[PDB]
DNA sequence: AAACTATGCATGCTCTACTGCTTCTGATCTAGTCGACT
């Protein structure tokens, strides 16, 4: 599709047991970036947000 | 010798603290129902 309403991403790791708590860490890092306007929650394995992309 | 006064004591009353037991109340964890989303 050349258009849409959101960007859907999936995060995975080649190892088995490593994928334990990636999403909270990435979420916190992005929040520290200063791009998240809304967060679903503000252990989890899913979250939809509203990024602030530069324009 | 008799009348008045003095001390002395006891017991019930009141208050304030103190400790320990019992009951009531406020803070903290989950089932169900409705709704949101991918
Ligand atoms: N009710 C549902 N049931 C099963 N899978 C679903 C679903 N709703 C979404 N998915 C799954 C399948 C969907 O492909 C995937 C993406 O969800 P979106 O971002 O909400 N819808 P899309 O990306 O297709 O349209 P756009 O490009 O405009 O955003 O999530
Ligand atoms: Mg989508
Ligand atoms: Mg989506």
Present the secondary structure layout:
Elements: H1 22-33
The structure holds the ligand Nc1ncnc2c1ncn2[C@H]1C[C@H](O)[C@@H](COP(=O)(O)NP(=O)(O)OP(=O)(O)O)O1 and magnesium ion (MG) (2 copies).
It binds one DNA strand of 38 nucleotides through loops.
PDB class: ligase/transferase/dna
Keywords: nhej, DNA gap, fill-in synthesis, ligation, XLF, paxx, Polymerase mu, DNA repair, Ligase IV, LIGASE-TRANSFERASE-DNA complex
Entry title: The gap-filling complex with Pol mu engaged in the NHEJ pathway
Task: Report on this structure.
The chain is mainly α. The chain has one helix spanning 22-33. The longest helix has 12 residues, at 22-33. The protein starts with 21 loop residues before the first helix and ends in a 22-residue tail after the last helix. The structure holds ligand DZ4 and magnesium ion (MG) (2 copies). Residues 4, 6, 8 line the site of one magnesium ion. It binds one DNA strand of 38 nucleotides through residues 6, 8, 40, 46, 48. This is DNA-directed DNA/RNA polymerase mu.
Note the main attributes of this structure:
1 chains; 55 residues; mainly alpha; globular; binds the ligand Nc1ncnc2c1ncn2[C@H]1C[C@H](O)[C@@H](COP(=O)(O)NP(=O)(O)OP(=O)(O)O)O1; binds magnesium ion; DNA-binding; DNA-directed DNA/RNA polymerase mu
Share of helix, binned: 10-25%
Write out the distinct hetero groups bound to the structure.
Answer: the ligand Nc1ncnc2c1ncn2[C@H]1C[C@H](O)[C@@H](COP(=O)(O)NP(=O)(O)OP(=O)(O)O)O1, magnesium ion
Helix count from the secondary structure assignment: 1
Gross geometry: globular
Tell me about the biggest sheet?
Answer: none
Order of helices and strands: H
Beta-strand portion reads under 5%
What is the terminal-to-terminal distance? 22 Å
Number of strands: 0
Structural class: mainly alpha
User: What Rg do the Cα atoms give?
Assistant: 13 Å
């Amino acid at each position: 599709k050349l258009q849409g309403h959101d960007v859907d991403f999936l995060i995975t790791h080649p190892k088995e047991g490593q994928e334990a708590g990636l999403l909270p860490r990435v979420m916190c890092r992005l929040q520290d970036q200063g791009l998240i306007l809304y967060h679903q929650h503000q252990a989890f394995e899913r979250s939809f947000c509203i990024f602030r992309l530069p324009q």
